Structures are given as structure tokens and as C-alpha cells.
Design a protein around this ligand. Structure first.
Ligand SMILES: [Cu+2]
Ligand SMILES: [Cu+2]
Ligand SMILES: [Zn+2]
Ligand SMILES: [Zn+2]
Lengths: 151, 148
């Protein structure tokens, strides 16, 4: 009955990677709180997006398809107005390969045309430069996961 | 409208159960096709659970059977069933398990939408009688149902 307040996504690695972690999307007053904790990432910034298809059956994560863009807008940063619904920018891994990230996304929701429920999270090998189209030159996909309804 | 749904199941702690499940919209109902590996030989409980959360080691985070009508536990062919009562999946001597059938209850939009819910494979058989689980026991694999 009660509208969806939480969303959870466990990312598993693509072929020839050890990238794993959990991402929670919690509803707050002024948007949706994104909290991500990953391991097995190479040190540095990694592309971090919601993709249109919730399919992680492919070895290379190609089955996730393109960036979740139901408004047919350009690729950008989370802070940008001109962005895809699934433009969550970059996640940064430390020297130990641990990556934490928490911020308030004002675009994502858990119901309607722009619902992220049943979509995929994709972590990329390289940095999302937030300029290049349509991907940000993030390159290969190192981890995939499907966004599910939380409690 | 969403025509297809896909769910990759990964194992819980101390299990090797993996596979892919597709839900395709067909004449009559929704065609369920499941291909699993690393299951013990025999029948295994096979359900859609209310929470799409596989973050727990033992798959407890998936919660109970997806039951938005507050009905009793039953078989897929039964009228008195949970929306996520997909019965049992059977693994051969090699631990491979295939299963295809037409479910007339599951849909990809509305109150009874399976999109964003979890698939759970159990250690033991779902007897389709015992409440509320069918005495299926421990959870060996978890996965979230996504849009195809
Ligand atoms: Cu991406
Ligand atoms: Cu179950
Ligand atoms: Zn994008
Ligand atoms: Zn049930």
C-alpha cells in the first residue's frame, strides 16, 4: 500500500573484475539520498550511472543498455539540469580499492515515467568526464546490478 | 509497456547457486524461463519475494513472499496463492535446473508488478501446503527482477 521509500542495488563484477558492493536510495525531504559502498575498484574515479535495462546477464554488462534517459536529454553531471535521469557522476576508489559516496539526488524517484526501480546500476573502468556524449568516455563496464524495492 | 523482465540470481553465503530467469509477455499470460546451476539434485522452492534486497549473506533481506492480496501460500496452478508462488524448480544429478511455464498472475506494471521484486531459490522443496513458506527452509540464491 505505502509508496516506496527505499531502494537497494547489489552490484556484482563483469568478466575479469572483482568489483562488488551495495547502493541504497533513501527518500529525504529535499530529494533522494544516494549511499554507495564498493570494493575491488582500481584507485581513482569510476563512471557511476543508472542504465535503462535491468539486465546483468551479459559477461561485459552490455545487456544493461544505455544510460536511463526517458526525457531524451544530453549526458551531464548530477548537479547539471541538462542530464540523464541516471547521471550519478563518478564514484572514487582509494588506494585500497574501497569507494564510499553519499549525496542528495533531486531527479531520481521510485514511481512513474522516471522510476529507477527495475533499472540497472553500472560502474565503468575509466572516469566519466561529464562532457563527452553520450557516455562521458567512461569506457568498459566493471560491475552491474538491478535496483529493487527496499523496506 | 514493459514486455520482458530479467533476473540474475547470485548465491547466498556457503552456496554456488547462479543462473538467469526471463519473464516474457505471451498469449494468455507471462512465460517464465529459468536456467540455474550449482543446485543440489532435487526440487527447490522458487518464489518472488516482496523486497528487492539481496544485500544479506543469507538472503533474509528479500523478506517474505510477494503477497500484495494477503492470500495464503499455494502452487502456481492454485487460485489461493501469493503473486510470487512460482512453485518448485528441479535440479538434475549435475545440478543444472531448467523450468518453463505460463504464469497467469504475474505482470510488469501496477499493484502486482514483479519489477523491482526479488527471486529466491530455497535449499529444500516447497510442499505447497505448509504456511506461510511451504517449509522450503534456507535461501541458497537471491536476485532482483529488472526491466528487459
Ligand atoms: Cu554508465
Ligand atoms: Cu521463497
Ligand atoms: Zn548519461
Ligand atoms: Zn508463497
Amino acid at each position: 500500500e505505502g509508496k516506496t521509500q527505499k531502494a537497494v542495488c547489489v552490484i556484482y563484477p563483469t568478466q575479469d573484475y572483482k568489483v562488488t558492493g551495495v547502493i541504497t536510495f533513501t527518500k529525504s525531504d529535499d530529494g533522494v539520498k544516494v549511499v554507495a559502498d564498493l570494493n575491488g575498484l582500481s584507485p581513482g574515479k569510476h563512471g557511476f550511472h543508472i542504465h535503462e535495462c535491468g539486465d546483468c546477464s551479459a559477461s561485459d554488462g552490455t545487456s544493461a543498455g544505455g544510460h536511463f534517459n526517458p526525457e531524451e536529454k544530453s549526458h551531464g553531471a548530477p548537479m547539471d539540469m541538462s542530464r540523464h535521469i541516471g547521471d550519478l557522476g563518478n564514484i572514487t576508489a582509494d588506494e585500497n580499492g574501497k569507494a564510499h559516496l553519499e549525496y542528495i539526488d533531486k531527479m531520481i524517484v521510485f514511481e512513474g515515467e522516471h522510476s529507477i526501480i527495475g533499472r540497472s546500476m553500472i560502474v565503468h573502468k575509466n572516469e566519466d568526464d561529464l562532457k563527452t556524449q553520450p557516455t562521458g568516455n567512461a569506457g568498459a563496464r566493471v560491475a552491474c546490478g538491478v535496483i529493487g524495492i527496499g523496506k
